């Protein structure tokens, strides 16, 4: 049905299954908490993580502004 004729690189599937480990507003909440938690830190790795979180926090702020401007009725 869903073109299930290709095994799709069994080794790659085993890799993805090993790597393989939701909500609506819990995500934005965790983003803000993690970014403010990591801002207090001092490690360079935690600094890169905090900058990545700020990046996603503001790309989300831009998409929230776009979603707010667009609307239906």
């Amino acid at each position: 049905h869903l073109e299930r004729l290709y095994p799709t690189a069994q080794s790659k599937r085993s890799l993805w299954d090993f790597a393989s480990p939701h909500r609506a507003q819990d995500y934005r909440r965790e983003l803000d908490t993690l970014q403010s938690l990591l801002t207090t830190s001092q490690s360079s790795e935690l600094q890169a993580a905090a900058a990545l979180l700020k990046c996603q926090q503001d790309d989300d702020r831009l998409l929230q502004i776009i979603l707010n401007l667009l609307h239906k009725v």
Binding site: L2, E3, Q10, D59
Partner: protein, 341 residues
């Protein structure tokens, strides 16, 4: 025969597959008559395009392993499948050197003998046989050339097949939009890998938005937006997670500044240098990530969505383009990166 008969007109066959001889009976009785219908049926169920009948002929004029697939008697996919006794592998890499054996529109292809089949299947790798490779090429051809299988006759057949189901819906949609616009909309939908299969919602969207918009681009964008949950399930992976490469407002405005809706075409021609710079910025931000998985999708403003897609169709034929309206709710859109200017 007679030299007074005018021409004995005959229509060209829609789909033809010409393979070499010495497999007329060497290949026969191993699928080739059930596998083809199986793959066609699966692709139709995935898409909904009414594919035509397939004519299979064995020609001795060519070599031993040459197969060609032609749409309306013009070859569109040729290849010499090696092939006679060497089965192909699509994930051949230095791993195939790790298991040392002798080693196309498909992925990286390398051919191995049938004596190696047992030990390599102990490793559980790809073992495309003749039927499998032929049907893989057939499926790729049908997927990339499905727009040529959607005519006025095909759409009329689809409408007539659903007359018993939804009579008044069909009568309303026919009075709202003509056959030409409807078929063009279906072709544009299939060109974006959007399934026709769910015809009820498509007809309802056609009825709802055909009275308001007459331009084909806007109407097909509205019909795409009418399939929010289908698009969400088709492209999002994981749970309520949708990878995104959202565009900056400046880039969207620059693209929108040259819609050029002059002759009901609305071609997007801004400047070759400017489009080169924008494509360079997209390449620098997005990256390549071709070897990677999860099918990230580009999300941009609806009014220019199609205009963006054909801008990046040349390089990133994979990466889909989606509209903000096309996204349903309860989705955690994760921005992988903004395309800056």
């Amino acid at each position: 025969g007679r030299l007074g008969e005018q021409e004995a007109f005959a229509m060209t066959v829609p789909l033809l597959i010409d393979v070499d001889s010495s497999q007329q009976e060497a290949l026969e009785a191993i699928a080739l008559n059930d596998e083809l219908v199986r793959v066609r049926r699966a692709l139709y169920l995935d898409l909904g395009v009414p594919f035509p009948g397939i004519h299979l002929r064995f020609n001795e004029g060519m070599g031993e392993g040459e197969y060609l697939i032609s749409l309306q008697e013009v070859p569109v996919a040729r290849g010499e499948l090696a092939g006679y006794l060497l089965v192909r592998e699509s994930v051949s890499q230095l791993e195939l050197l790790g298991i040392p054996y002798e080693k196309l529109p498909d992925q990286e292809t390398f051919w191995v003998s049938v004596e190696y089949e047992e030990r390599l299947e102990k490793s559980q790798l790809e073992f495309f046989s003749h039927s499998q490779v032929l049907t893989w090429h057939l499926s790729h051809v049908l997927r990339e050339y499905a727009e040529d299988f959607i005519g006025i006759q095909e759409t009329r057949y689809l409408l007539e097949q659903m007359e018993g189901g939804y009579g008044e819906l069909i009568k309303e949609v026919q009075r709202i939009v003509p056959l030409q616009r409807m078929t063009e909309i279906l072709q544009r939908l299939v060109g974006e890998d959007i399934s026709i299969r769910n015809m009820r919602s498509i007809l309802e969207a056609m009825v709802e938005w055909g009275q308001k918009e007459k331009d084909v681009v806007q109407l097909t964008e509205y019909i795409r937006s009418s399939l929010k949950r289908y698009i969400c399930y088709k492209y999002a992976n994981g749970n309520n997670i949708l990878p995104a490469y959202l565009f900056d407002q400046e880039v969207e405005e620059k693209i929108r500044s040259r819609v050029r809706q002059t002759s009901a075409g609305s071609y997007l021609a801004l400047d070759p240098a400017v489009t080169e710079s924008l494509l360079e910025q997209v390449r620098k931000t997005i990256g390549d990530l071709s070897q990677i998985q999860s099918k990230p999708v580009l999300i941009v403003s609806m009014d220019i969505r199609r205009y963006v897609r054909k801008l990046i169709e040349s390089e990133y034929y994979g990466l889909p383009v989606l509209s903000y309206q096309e996204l349903t709710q309860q989705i955690n859109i994760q921005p992988l990166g903004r395309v800056c200017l």
